[PDB]
Amino acid sequence: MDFTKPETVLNLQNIRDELVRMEDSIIFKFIERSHFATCPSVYEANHPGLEIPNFKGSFLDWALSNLEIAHSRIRRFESPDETPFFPDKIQKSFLPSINYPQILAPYAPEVNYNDKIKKVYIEKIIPLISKRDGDDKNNFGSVATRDIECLQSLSRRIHFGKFVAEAKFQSDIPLYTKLIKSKDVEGIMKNITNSAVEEKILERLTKKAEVYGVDPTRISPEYLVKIYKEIVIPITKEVEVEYLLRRLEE
Amino acid sequence: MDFTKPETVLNLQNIRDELVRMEDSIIFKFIERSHFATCPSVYEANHPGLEIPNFKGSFLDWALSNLEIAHSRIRRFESPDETPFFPDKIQKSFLPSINYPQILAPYAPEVNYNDKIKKVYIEKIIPLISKRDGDDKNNFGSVATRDIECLQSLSRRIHFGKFVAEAKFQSDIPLYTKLIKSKDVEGIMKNITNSAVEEKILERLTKKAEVYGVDPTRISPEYLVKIYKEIVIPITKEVEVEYLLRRLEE
Numbered sequence: 001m002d003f004t005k006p007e008t009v010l011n012l013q014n015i016r017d018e019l020v021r022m023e024d025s026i027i028f029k030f031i032e033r034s035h036f037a038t039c040p041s042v043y044e045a046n047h048p049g050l051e052i053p054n055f056k057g058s059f060l061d062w063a064l065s066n067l068e069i070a071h072s073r074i075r076r077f078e079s080p081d082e083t084p085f086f087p088d089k090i091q092k093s094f095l096p097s098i099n100y101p102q103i104l105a106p107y108a109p110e111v112n113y114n115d116k117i118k119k120v121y122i123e124k125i126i127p128l129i130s131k132r133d134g135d136d137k138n139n140f141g142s143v144a145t146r147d148i149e150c151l152q153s154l155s156r157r158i159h160f161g162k163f164v165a166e167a168k169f170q171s172d173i174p175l176y177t178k179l180i181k182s183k184d185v186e187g188i189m190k191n192i193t194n195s196a197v198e199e200k201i202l203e204r205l206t207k208k209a210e211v212y213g214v215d216p217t218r219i220s221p222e223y224l225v226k227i228y229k230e231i232v233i234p235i236t237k238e239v240e241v242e243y244l245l246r247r248l249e250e
Numbered sequence: 251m252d253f254t255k256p257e258t259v260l261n262l263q264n265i266r267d268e269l270v271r272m273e274d275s276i277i278f279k280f281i282e283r284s285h286f287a288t289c290p291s292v293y294e295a296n297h298p299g300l301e302i303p304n305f306k307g308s309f310l311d312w313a314l315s316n317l318e319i320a321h322s323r324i325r326r327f328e329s330p331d332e333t334p335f336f337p338d339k340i341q342k343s344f345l346p347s348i349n350y351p352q353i354l355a356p357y358a359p360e361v362n363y364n365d366k367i368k369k370v371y372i373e374k375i376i377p378l379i380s381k382r383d384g385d386d387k388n389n390f391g392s393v394a395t396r397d398i399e400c401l402q403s404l405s406r407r408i409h410f411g412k413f414v415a416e417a418k419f420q421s422d423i424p425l426y427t428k429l430i431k432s433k434d435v436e437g438i439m440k441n442i443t444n445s446a447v448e449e450k451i452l453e454r455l456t457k458k459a460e461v462y463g464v465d466p467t468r469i470s471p472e473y474l475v476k477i478y479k480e481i482v483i484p485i486t487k488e489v490e491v492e493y494l495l496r497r498l499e500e
């Protein structure tokens with residue numbers, strides 16, 4: 001895919017390849033984060049000892065918002081595949097802007113599920129992948145930086161549902177128009193679900209978990225499957241139906 | 251290992267485990283960077299189009315130095331296992347400092363091979379792992395951030411030779427004292443080389459390259475072996491002999 005050549009983007013085979021490559025990215029990052037304890041103090045707002053001068057929020061929030069401000073200055077969020085966790089904080093680039101042709105509907109930047117993602121990550125994913133419960137006082141920064149890597153990968157994968165939805169829309173405008181016009185969510189869901197393909201994904205995930213990071217001479221497959229089945233796939237679909245419901249300007 | 255409990259640190263079995271875990275980390279990061287072209291413009295100082303207001307250096311340098319300043323404020327370089335690429339730029343922490351007991355010799359922060367590492371990474375490693383030659387104008391930031399991940403992993407692995415050297419020193423002070431006193435480098439090299447173990451490492455690396463990121467239903471083993479054999483292991487040894495030669499205060 002080349003975000004300056006629209007045809008490489010709305011191409012369904014290029015989309016599968018990118019989704020499959022993100023699958024590995026996400027698995028590698030979960031393995032990196034699994035080496036550390038849960039570190040509850042990292043996600044708690046204004047924790048004594050991890051309190052940042054003139055900042056209201058958690059240790060995780062400071063590290064992530066600061067990273068976004070720096071990257072926004074170098075054009076990160078000008079790209080259609082990048083959605084920010086702190087939309088109010090991002091700056092304008094100090095480098096010549098890349099001219100990205102409009103590929104998605106105009107309101108695309110407004111379809112943003114990062115709050116929900118950050119939330120389920122902390123409340124549901126951390127507890128399954130961490131090595132143990134409790135704070136590891138000497139690894140708060142190691143943890144936060146690994147968390148940022150996991151969040152940015154999940155975010156890109158989940159919001160990639162926008163390109164999936166646009167490809168589908170364009171391939172059958174008459175059908176989608178009627179579904180959108182009558183706001184038939186059940187009809188849309190049924191058209192964006194291929195149960196056969198979803199089983200296949202889960203089966204491949206189980207086999208990757210079995211070999212990845214395992215010394216040939218780290219993460220439970222059951223949990224990897226639970227995460228994709230209960231969190232990743234379902235939220236990707238929410239992004240797709242919301243993108244679609246507003247497709248005829250909204 | 252717990253950098254607040256010296257015995258967990260100079261323990262040789264805890265050291266193997268940490269080295270083996272970094273082996274996976276490094277392999278995963280090489281795979282992430284392999285998806286992009288060489289991007290020569292990223293490493294060139296003051297490139298037209300990637301020129302940063304009031305900054306002399308490359309795009310890579312700006313991203314990396316800025317990251318270090320932010321992390322230094324949250325105590326990254328207070329930890330003995332973290333060595334900075336920009337020692338002159340790092341700040342003092344605005345959080346209560348962690349009291350790390352002196353585990354390594356005092357001059358330890360001065361043994362820093364990051365310039366050499368950054369250099370061989372650009373000149374020798376990039377060309378072997380990149381997908382193709384040339385600039386990918388729309389992925390300069392994606393590349394730089396992947397480069398930072400690779401550099402920080404290699405840096406931690408290579409400078410980990412300081413702990414290896416201190417463990418050895420402490421286990422046979424009479425022997426090491428004579429080697430150090432007469433500055434016998436050849437004698438030191440011969441005592442820190444177990445050829446049998448080095449073959450074994452290379453063999454395991456070949457088998458990891460064969461399964462990692464390969465869909466069960468990315469990086470050449472030959473190149474992975476060349477990198478560890480010609481760059482990683484040799485520079486780790488340079489860190490160890492330099493740390494040792496200054497051991498009796500220097």
Ligand SMILES: N[C@@H](Cc1c[nH]c2ccccc12)C(=O)O
Binds near residue numbers: 140143321325327332
């Ligand atoms: N492990 C140490 C040092 C550290 C490693 N990576 C970091 C990133 C940011 C801040 C600190 C760190 C800590 O968590 O404190």
Ligand SMILES: N[C@@H](Cc1c[nH]c2ccccc12)C(=O)O
Binds near residue numbers: 389391
């Ligand atoms: N791929 C785009 C956007 C991007 C992704 N990650 C980044 C990190 C920093 C800056 C930009 C980016 C680019 O390289 O420009």
